[PDB]
Amino acid sequence: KIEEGKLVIWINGDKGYNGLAEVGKKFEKDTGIKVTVEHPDKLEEKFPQVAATGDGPDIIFWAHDRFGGYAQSGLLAEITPDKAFQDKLYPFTWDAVRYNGKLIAYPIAVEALSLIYNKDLLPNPPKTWEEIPALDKELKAKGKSALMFNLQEPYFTWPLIAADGGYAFKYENGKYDIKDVGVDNAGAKAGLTFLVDLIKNKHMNADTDYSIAEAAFNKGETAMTINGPWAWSNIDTSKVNYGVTVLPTFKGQPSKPFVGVLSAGINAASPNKELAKEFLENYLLTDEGLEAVNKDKPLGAVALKSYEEELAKDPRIAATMENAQKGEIMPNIPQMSAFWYAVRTAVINAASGRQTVDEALKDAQTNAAAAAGCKXX
Amino acid sequence: XYXXXYX
Numbered sequence: 001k002i003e004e005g006k007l008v009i010w011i012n013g014d015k016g017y018n019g020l021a022e023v024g025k026k027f028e029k030d031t032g033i034k035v036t037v038e039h040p041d042k043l044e045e046k047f048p049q050v051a052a053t054g055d056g057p058d059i060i061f062w063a064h065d066r067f068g069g070y071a072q073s074g075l076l077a078e079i080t081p082d083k084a085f086q087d088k089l090y091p092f093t094w095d096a097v098r099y100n101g102k103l104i105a106y107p108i109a110v111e112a113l114s115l116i117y118n119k120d121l122l123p124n125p126p127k128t129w130e131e132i133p134a135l136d137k138e139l140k141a142k143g144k145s146a147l148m149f150n151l152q153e154p155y156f157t158w159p160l161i162a163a164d165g166g167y168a169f170k171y172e173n174g175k176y177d178i179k180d181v182g183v184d185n186a187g188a189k190a191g192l193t194f195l196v197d198l199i200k201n202k203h204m205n206a207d208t209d210y211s212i213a214e215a216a217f218n219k220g221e222t223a224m225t226i227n228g229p230w231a232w233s234n235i236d237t238s239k240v241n242y243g244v245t246v247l248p249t250f251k252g253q254p255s256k257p258f259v260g261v262l263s264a265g266i267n268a269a270s271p272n273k274e275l276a277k278e279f280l281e282n283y284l285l286t287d288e289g290l291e292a293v294n295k296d297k298p299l300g301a302v303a304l305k306s307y308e309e310e311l312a313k314d315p316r317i318a319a320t321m322e323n324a325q326k327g328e329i330m331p332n333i334p335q336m337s338a339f340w341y342a343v344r345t346a347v348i349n350a351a352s353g354r355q356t357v358d359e360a361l362k363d364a365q366t367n368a369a370a371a372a373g374c375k376x377x
Numbered sequence: 378x379y380x381x382x383y384x
């Protein structure tokens with residue numbers, strides 16, 4: 001069902017697909033092979049439906065974590081970059097595209113939360129979480145707060161919770177131990193305790209969500225927020241003089257945001273695996289290839305060293321990459337659903353007092369590990 | 378569900 005002698009590519013419509021099409025035109029001028037870039041709605045939930053029947057695109061772009069599922073279903077071609085090519089990309093990005101020890105996609109770009117701060121309120125942002133309470137009191141004396149960020153989703157709160165030793169699933173040798181959940185260890189308790197104290201002591205409000213925080217920061221009401229590169233254009237619009245920097249440390253250790261790696265996977269059913277490898281390796285994953293996509297819609301930090309070094313002259317991108325390198329690649333396993341569910345509940349419950357930190361994390365641990373312990377139905 | 382396992 002997949003046409004031989006051409007490349008069909010699916011990529012999210014919020015990406016620089018026109019720039020990607022430009023890379024395709026360059027490919028076609030060189031080889032006479034036509035490259036079609038499409039951006040189907042919910043493409044990542046369509047792919048596993050159609051690919052299962054031997055149809056779909058030759059190449060699919062999505063966040064790496066979805067690829068675990070595809071690989072489990074045998075929907076992705078194993079890729080074969082040599083060592084010289086692999087050395088062109090940051091090692092940790094390769095970690096994001098491994099399933100059962102196999103490389104199943106090419107890393108393209110990297111996203112992670114950073115500390116975003118108001119340069120006018122705060123020219124010298126805190127290096128530590130611990131100094132934020134003192135800073136809050138000082139700022140609030142003039143009716144500004146130190147920090148507002150989304151507290152409703154583990155994605156945003158996990159970096160602090162994980163800093164001193166929390167983790168979702170233990171990463172071992174390009175594999176995850178789904179029975180090793182790090183939700184209720186002393187590291188997570190410390191982090192969550194500090195977070196809950198911030199809320200209990202009114203340094204932060206338990207109700208703060210994504211929109212509230214974004215609004216407050218972009219209006220100059222709070223000196224700091226925690227968000228990703230997807231938020232920058234909204235701040236550009238606000239005219240706030242903002243900086244983007246490394247997340248504060250906690251107990252001397254980096255905050256550990258989850259890292260999302262935009263990745264390009266090859267349809268197992270494709271008759272054009274060689275064409276796709278050539279396109280991805282020698283056309284897209286070059287300075288010129290990524291720049292063409294980046295110009296259409298900024299990629300953020302990229303997996304390709306040579307081009308990241310150029311983009312990193314923008315300190316916001318340098319900060320994204322730094323936070324990413326200090327962060328936790330998002331596990332690409334289906335058991336993550338039980339982690340999110342359980343932790344989301346645990347943080348809500350603990351910040352609202354409905355449970356102690358110890359009890360919330362214990363239950364979360366039990367629930368996350370239990371739902372990870374089995375599969376089927 | 379309706380299929381078994383376990384995976």
Ligand SMILES: *[C@@H]1O[C@H](CO)[C@@H](O)[C@H](O)[C@H]1NC(=O)CCCCCCC(C)C
Pocket residue numbers: 377380381382383
């Ligand atoms: C099936 O698994 C569910 C989740 O553990 C249970 O709640 C439910 O009671 C179980 N049903 C049965 O035990 C009937 C099983 C018939 C054999 C199913 C397994 C075989 C390998 C398909």
Ligand SMILES: *[C@@H]1O[C@H](CO)[C@@H](O)[C@H](O)[C@H]1NC(C)=O
Pocket residue numbers: 373374375382383384
């Ligand atoms: C189901 O999976 C569990 C491990 O999760 C295993 O102990 C059991 O043998 C499996 N049963 C099957 C595949 O029938």
Ligand SMILES: *[C@H]1O[C@H](CO)[C@@H](O)[C@H](O)[C@@H]1O
Pocket residue numbers: 072073074375376380384
């Ligand atoms: C569990 O998930 C696997 C993924 O390959 C399926 O094949 C199975 O039928 C069940 O949905």
Ligand SMILES: C[As](C)(=O)[O-]
Pocket residue numbers: none
């Ligand atoms: C699959 As059963 C609950 O009969 O062991």
Ligand SMILES: C[As](C)(=O)[O-]
Pocket residue numbers: 374383
């Ligand atoms: C599916 As079972 C091994 O918990 O009976």
Ligand SMILES: [Zn+2]
Pocket residue numbers: 013039040041
């Ligand atoms: Zn579209």
Ligand SMILES: [Zn+2]
Pocket residue numbers: 063065066
């Ligand atoms: Zn995802």
Ligand SMILES: [Zn+2]
Pocket residue numbers: 082084085
């Ligand atoms: Zn080579």
Ligand SMILES: [Zn+2]
Pocket residue numbers: 133201203
């Ligand atoms: Zn305090």
Ligand SMILES: [Zn+2]
Pocket residue numbers: 170172177180
């Ligand atoms: Zn283990």
Ligand SMILES: [Zn+2]
Pocket residue numbers: 063111260
């Ligand atoms: Zn993402």
Ligand SMILES: [Zn+2]
Pocket residue numbers: 287288291
């Ligand atoms: Zn150029």
Ligand SMILES: [Zn+2]
Pocket residue numbers: 359363
């Ligand atoms: Zn309990």
